[PDB]
Point group: C4
Chain length 468, copies 4
């Protein structure tokens, strides 16, 4: 053995854990934050031009976007000379191919215009949706910047923005490899109005490859034009590692991946034989409730890890033609998904360690604890949970039209979590509503602690009496 | 059944709750925050002109106000051309009618000037009050900007400002529909001094209507001139929705309103029949103490909801003449009142859900919990409540002449709530008073926790000992 | 009772309390914060000139001080014309008399210069002290700006600065009533070097009087020149009220003062007759320990209230000659002292209210507690009190040369109070020391909570066990 | 003894403590923070030149570094004239000798370049390491700025930077004593490219000596060039005190040092005679464990102190030749080490005071206090400790490529300590990941408090049952 059985289970668990830790350490590159930070500082913090003070992070109108797209954008994207024409950003980043700019727009006449306001206003442009999307050519046709291209022909996928979710098709244009031609193309796009009252979003896409450390970086700047006015920017910088098997460390990581696959295969084959007939109530004590989930997530990882590594050359064929736009959005998306899945799996694997330290003599210390709150901490918490949601609803209804922290109801939830801890922005809350604001704040911060003390006293009293 | 009776009460309560939730979701428009945020950024954050850095949010003198009123105000209010003379703000907002500027001022000679300073100073202008208000013409009469107009003729109401509450009458002027004429009028107002040492407040009012989503926005910029000097700005943007019954969703909301009225009528008739003779002590257990309040607030809502929907066309008759100033202050005020009332009602309805969950075996968990502490938390808390107010009084007397967070005594209360949580501005507190400041801070944060621990220990001791 | 005796004591206490509350409300003027805020914004936030961005609050060198003293200082102090020569600040503040500028400096040759660095360094100027103070004339004598004047002839007193405490004598100059002559005088002072390597402090003093609300404001700007280099500014704006008995409210306040004096005389005579022979152990139960202190502080107030109101005309004689510098420093100092004393007295009077509420059935709720935690909280807290001071000493020794929050050891104490609550500036702490910083932070925040939990658990265990 | 023995132990402990406190007060100079603050403000906050807004603290490119090194650096380092050529910074700091600039760089061709990207990329420059370091001359040789000099010939040591640890050798150049020649040298270095794609770090070193208070200040500005691009600055200002025995206070401190040596000798001899044969289990009670750490730290501190006080003149021989670069890095390093050691020793000495207070009737309060939790708080805390590290691992894996607070895994630990207290930067966390961010935040802040409350309930119940 019994002790021998638990000891062999322990040792195989530590081998699994150390393999997973090695994999995570290897996959996590060192000092990769500074790469993205330099990219973001270059493309987001420099003023759009010498005179005015606004940058991409603080954009307010369409003219600001036009100034940015021919000002700081071209200056930070095409670097003159190293001492050919390759545009090594920061002298060592090698802008790949050409950037691409894309526009999404809707149709005129998409309201039910009020009859009273019919002789003054003549046209509408509703908020973005697939039903309101425009598909007709406009302006001087003369190319692909004025002709709709479907999401299948326009080789790409959708994207989830702040205001809505965008299709991934529309009117696009591929810029050139040098500064002068891109400047001319942007000037032509500005002369013949390309953004006029129907535009709902604009994407800018490009990618660079640092050679000193082999890492690609995918940049997707997005500017959203609401139906009300103004702009809303977003950047989403993301590094990638496509070319692998360069040093012995890479082969070591590949071997670690193979042995991890063997480990999880052994776990799943051993777990399934333990649920066959014996222990039909196997899903209890919650420890089992974890150990299946692990392998589940594990196999999902393999899926992604197989679906994204075997489809790089079919997309890295850009190497044969360095004069087009390389699509790297899918690789970045799947890299992000794999990162999230791996982080969740390692977190759960780490917390599964308690299964073994319990075998000693921590039953009372732990056992008792986890058993003395199943219907106590989770039984008295219904009242605070209801009051929390009621206060969130009240805050969302009162505020949320004046305060950014109280729009988008779910965010209100988070805001309350930051009010209890001490992250408060009371100035704007009080400014928005001079009567209900302070009342809400004081009543919330008082009632939360009052009911928490009631909970604690009730647990103490009740428990004591029960064990008296 | 008895169980059947509580079950039918439960089901009717959930129907009422779902109807109320549908009403609140429908009345709360989506992404309406960005409309106000764009408006405020355009009219508050842009510098008053190209050279100096000050904006409306940071105004300091009368000359700054004069620069703003002919600089960033006109630039962000009259937009040149879309590719007529209609000034579509952000190309899609349609400034309605003309803006209006109004001034409130007091009379010379309103002190009891000290006899010693009688040959040194000659004139006074007291703080604003209805008793000190001026009503005589001044300067070149030549119109309504130099002649007092009563609050009845000047079609409007009062307003509650930071310093005082203002009447709503005074000297007003209606600007024009184009940039040149308004610029000329403002230049004429500046030449023949319109603001001179007697002015106490200045209002700027206008409204826009977005057609893509039918919403009005009412803007009322206010600048207060204290008797001491300087200016104090206030903006108070507010979106409004007048034209309804546009899509089927609006008719669905109307049906929801009707059925909600029926629901609350049923509730009130049931309450009044249950309060007739039996249970003359009906106002106990506190649950009843809530269920009447609900219907009370409910009927109040209807009042507002009826008093503001039937008085739109008598005020929207602006549609027949698009060359005057449309008064929308009353509609915005009543919309705000309705929003507050509805939020409070839904909060109370949500917290009334506990009445049913206690019928299960949870009733023994809120005995001690919601009972017991009736005279324990509410009995031991008199000492902390007194100490809190004593510290607030001390802080208001010591500080409050140097620190903005400690003026206006009630605000001191709120400041203390932010000191316990962790929102502290210790730099200015210590700078204002280098001896009493730190002493107050440390003694407050120590004594609060000390007395809280004493409360908790005393409650534990009494509970245990009492039931020992 | 007996009940009749406690009832008459209660009613006389509430009469005393309401009299004190009326006095405090009357003495606390309304919206007096905005006066000081406008003054400080005008004299501290405006840039020293159009081109440079630095202001008085952020000064770094002597040239910056020279730019300020002939730039924003003169611009915000002499206002051209209202539509004579009176300089109404903000058109309504009436600069009184003339401003005065004063300098304090030390003697050359006040080191014990190291023998090694004797051929490279020739002169010293030690830190400021009365022993190192200079008293000899320098430069072109030609007036009082280059001749030392004693603290008795130079009619004034000392001042407590950030670096040291300054005497109040030195080299002074009285400016003029108009802009041109003061500009000429400052230019002459700058030409013939007035600040050169020996200057240790510089004071600028003036005062204004608002006529709409009778209030004086005393301004004393101070710039300190350390022995190391640079400057350190301080402002100390203070509103003052000299001319009283203007409206009936003032006479009401005078009557309230008289009746308060009668009240405290009655209290002190009752206290002294209650201590004659009976109750030689009178100083117990701590309630008596309060009620004498009250009257003590009370009489002190009268002293100040009599020492500052009877010496106004002997100093307001400025009214007969409006061409000199009016000394108002003493009046402001005594006003501040009176404010502090009054605030402390009202705080103690307010907390003395518990003496009556305990006579009811509440005596069993705090009798127990105030005979219990007496040696439990005040006996178990010696360990946290020692650990707190040890950590403060460690932080002061490690930091304090790089971080402003950890110099001046007492301030370290306050910083720790802000770390527990959540006011943290971890960036600079970690930057100053990359190894000891985080170690100190984590160990402090862990050990504090650990020992607090041990304290509370020990009290619980001890209590229960004791009364088992 | 017995009481006599503990009393003599007490009195000798207080003599030791007062001697140590005197030493710490003496070694800690007063108002030495302002010296470093002025230096840092002068050399870090001034813009690199008049037009652009960037300073040393915010540098982004190589051109910014070149602008700084001939702009604000020369302006704040060579001061024109006092009313010779000595460059008294702030007129009273006496720049010592000449500054020195040093560069570290790597070799071309240090990748394993992918075969696919072989016709597009030609050269590499790996991250800095001793293996990749370059040692060949480059450019026009013509001096020592283009020729490698070993760490032994280049008289200096290593340094621990943000990105890596640097050797201390490389290509250096000694500037001149006047502004014109240094400007010419920097212009020549900029013309013939000195920083080109291989540079990995750059050091600037100089030192000043204030004569009014005898203190040296050592400045070492460092700029790191990552393999990705951009720059990362660091300053590390440090005041130093070399010339001692100037006043009687210095001799008093020397006598204190000698007597403190005598105290530790007496303590160590007593401890060694108390461990000879009797009490072979001597290492218990935590006092017998603390008092040996005390003496170990003390002897280490004195070893360091006597190692650095006798190693000054062989390095201060700069006095004979004021035309070279004085090396003060070692003295500053050992001063920092001594300060850290002394602070730790005094902290431990202060906390050792508890040994005596428990001899009174307080020992019954320290029993439960310091034991009833030996296996109770340290036994129930394994679960929170594991969950904390699991959450840190999850945060480091998810974030850390987008957020500066979540890179460098150990820092994540500290970040969590600041989230519980209330120091939160939720905006960037939510922006980096819009799904996992809020989930991580809410789950962490909920589970931490849940587990803490569970611990407290479990320990209370357990203790109660045990002593039932
Ligand atoms: C500027 C100022 C102007 C104004 C009159 C619209 N405003 C309110 O009116 C708020 N407000 C209530 O809720 C309220 C409730 C019961 C009686 C009186 C009032 C009352 O007067 C308000 C509300 C929030 C922030 C500023 C303001
Ligand atoms: C920039 C960097 C440079 C430098 C080498 C002086 N620096 C330290 O050296 C700190 N430091 C210790 O305490 C320490 C303690 C035991 C072994 C090694 C070290 C060790 O290396 C330090 C200390 C605080 C902030 C930055 C720095
Ligand atoms: C298409 O026509 C527009 C407007 O005449 C012109 O600006 C553009 O250059 C044309 N493009 C081509 C490819 O001819
Ligand atoms: C989509 O993929 C095909 C496959 O080769 C490619 O030829 C085409 O150019 C892509 N579409 C683009 C890049 O718009
Ligand atoms: C009224 O008189 C003033 C001053 O003479 C002048 O500026 C203004 O234009 C006049 N207004 C009218 C309507 O005549
Ligand atoms: C007040 O209301 C009446 C009602 O029609 C209107 O005629 C009048 O113009 C209003 N007053 C104004 C707009 O000043
Ligand atoms: C004193 O002499 C200085 C220098 O010669 C001169 O600037 C100043 O004006 C003189 N003052 C008087 C009062 O003559
Ligand atoms: C000090 O007080 C006396 C008393 O009248 C006055 O004459 C003298 O001018 C004062 N000293 C000054 C203002 O420097
Ligand atoms: C070395 O040569 C370079 C380039 O010709 C020149 O700039 C530099 O001044 C020369 N140095 C010396 C010491 O001759
Ligand atoms: C290193 O020390 C020696 C010892 O005198 C000295 O001569 C030499 O100049 C130093 N190296 C430098 C300063 O680069
Ligand atoms: Ca907090």
């Amino acid at each position: 053995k019994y002790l021998k059985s638990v000891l062999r289970e322990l040792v195989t668990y530590l081998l699994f854990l150390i393999v997973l830790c090695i994999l995570t350490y290897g996959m996590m590159s060192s000092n990769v934050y500074y790469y993205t930070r330099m990219m973001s500082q270059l493309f987001l913090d420099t003023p759009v031009s010498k005179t005015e003070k606004t940058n991409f992070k603080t954009l307010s109108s369409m003219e600001d976007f036009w100034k940015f797209t021919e000002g700081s954008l071209l200056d930070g994207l095409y670097w003159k000379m190293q001492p050919d024409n390759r545009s090594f950003i920061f002298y060592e980043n090698l802008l790949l191919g050409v950037p691409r700019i894309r526009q999404l727009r809707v149709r005129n006449g998409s309201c039910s215009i009020p009859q009273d306001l019919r002789d003054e206003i003549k046209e509408c442009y509703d908020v973005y949706s697939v039903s309101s999307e425009d598909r007709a050519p406009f302006g001087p046709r003369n190319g692909t910047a004025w002709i709709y291209t479907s999401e299948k022909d326009l080789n790409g996928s959708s994207h989830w923005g702040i205001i809505a979710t965008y299709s991934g098709a529309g009117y696009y244009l591929d810029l050139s490899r040098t500064r002068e031609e891109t400047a001319a193309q942007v000037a032509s796009l500005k002369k013949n109005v390309w953004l006029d009252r129907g535009t709902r979003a604009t994407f800018i896409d490009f990618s660079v490859y640092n050679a000193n450390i082999n890492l690609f970086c995918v940049v997707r700047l997005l500017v959203e034009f609401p139906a009300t006015g103004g702009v809303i920017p977003s950047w989403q910088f993301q590094p990638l590692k496509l070319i692998r098997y360069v040093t012995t460390f890479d082969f070591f990581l590949a071997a670690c991946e193979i042995i991890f696959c063997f480990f999880i295969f052994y776990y799943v084959v051993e777990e399934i034989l333990e649920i066959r007939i014996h222990k039909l109530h196997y899903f209890r004590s919650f420890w089992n409730c974890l150990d299946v989930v692990i392998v589940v997530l594990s196999v999902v990882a393999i899926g992604i890890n197989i679906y994204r590594t075997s489809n790089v050359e079919v997309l890295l064929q850009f190497l044969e033609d360095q004069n087009t736009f390389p699509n790297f959005e899918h690789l970045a998306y799947w890299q992000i998904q794999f990162n999230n899945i791996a982080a969740v799996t390692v977190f759960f694997v780490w917390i599964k360690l308690f299964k073994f330290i319990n075998f000693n003599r921590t039953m009372s210390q732990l056992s008792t604890t986890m058993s003395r709150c199943a219907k106590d901490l989770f039984g008295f918490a219904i009242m605070p949970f209801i009051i929390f949601l009621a206060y969130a609803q009240l805050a969302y209804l009162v505020f949320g039209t004046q305060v950014d922290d109280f729009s988008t109801f779910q965010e209100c939830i988070f805001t309350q979590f930051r009010i209890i801890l001490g992250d408060i922005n009371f100035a704007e809350i009080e400014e928005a509503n001079r009567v209900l604001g302070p009342i809400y704040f004081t009543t919330f911060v008082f009632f939360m602690f009052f009911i928490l003390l009631n909970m604690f006293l009730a647990i103490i009293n009740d428990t004591y009496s029960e064990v008296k």
